[PDB]
Subunit: 178 residues, 2 copies
Amino acid sequence: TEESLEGTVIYKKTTTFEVDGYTYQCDVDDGSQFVTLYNKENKLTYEKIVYKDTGKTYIGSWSSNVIEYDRFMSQQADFIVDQAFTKAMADEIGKTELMITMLLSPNTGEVMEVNFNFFTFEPYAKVPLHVYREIEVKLKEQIHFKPIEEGKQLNYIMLAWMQKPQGKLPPLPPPGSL
Amino acid sequence: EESLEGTVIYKKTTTFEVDGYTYQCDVDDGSQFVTLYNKENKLTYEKIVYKDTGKTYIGSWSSNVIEYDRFMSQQADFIVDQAFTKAMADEIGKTELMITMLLSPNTGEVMEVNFNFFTFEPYAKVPLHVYREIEVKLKEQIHFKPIEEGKQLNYIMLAWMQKPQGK
């Protein structure tokens, strides 16, 4: 809980990180210094979102056209991201935001893959790999949304958002069923 | 040498009346998220707000609610650790329990405690007396001084994630 950012940039160029139990790929565009960080087992990182029946591109933007809104699950995803960072990291990060992407099954709405985007000149580029791994694992374990409307027809459902860790309280729990 | 139970205890919304206390287990069927609490608790679903305005308090590392007390935080962690046996802790693995203490913004005493986990996690096989013990001990032993924004809230929420080490 007192672990901080590392002193030097970890994700500086295209690299593979083989750690105990998992491998992450770090892809860096040299001109923009934009980083795409993902479990190397992921297959959909650069895949086009299409209607699976036809291969035609899906170009909607409103999430209610692909998933049923769920307040708790949405806030829990935000909480998982926020809670992975210590106060020391969050204080060093300041106002800069991380991009997180969850790729959902269009059948079950479960999180199949997670990936991260940020720039090498941002504080996210000094965040220890185990933080990103923890986010990936927890999102995959806990989060799902019901596919609806066009979402049921896609190859996958992409939920990408910008967030900064700030030390938020956990969400109010959903009420008990029955 | 008590271990986790063989089947999930907290599978659906249920009231557990045992000799000496009653716990409510609320389970959201879609998420399989469990909220486990003493049925006498009233604040489990109460929004934390600034009492003067009713505006929601989101929580932030930049907003102090209590005076930092390392030793008191260590006692809270010790209570949670010691309530589990080594056998339970070994079966639980890396998964963490969420514990929430709700404090008086006046006295900083722990008014209520509740627990959260998912039905598919090992915490859903932890005997009820473990949670009861944690609740009782936190309420009697743990207190913090409210300061700054904490004095302005309806209640102070201290929530954390912990994997028990076991007695």
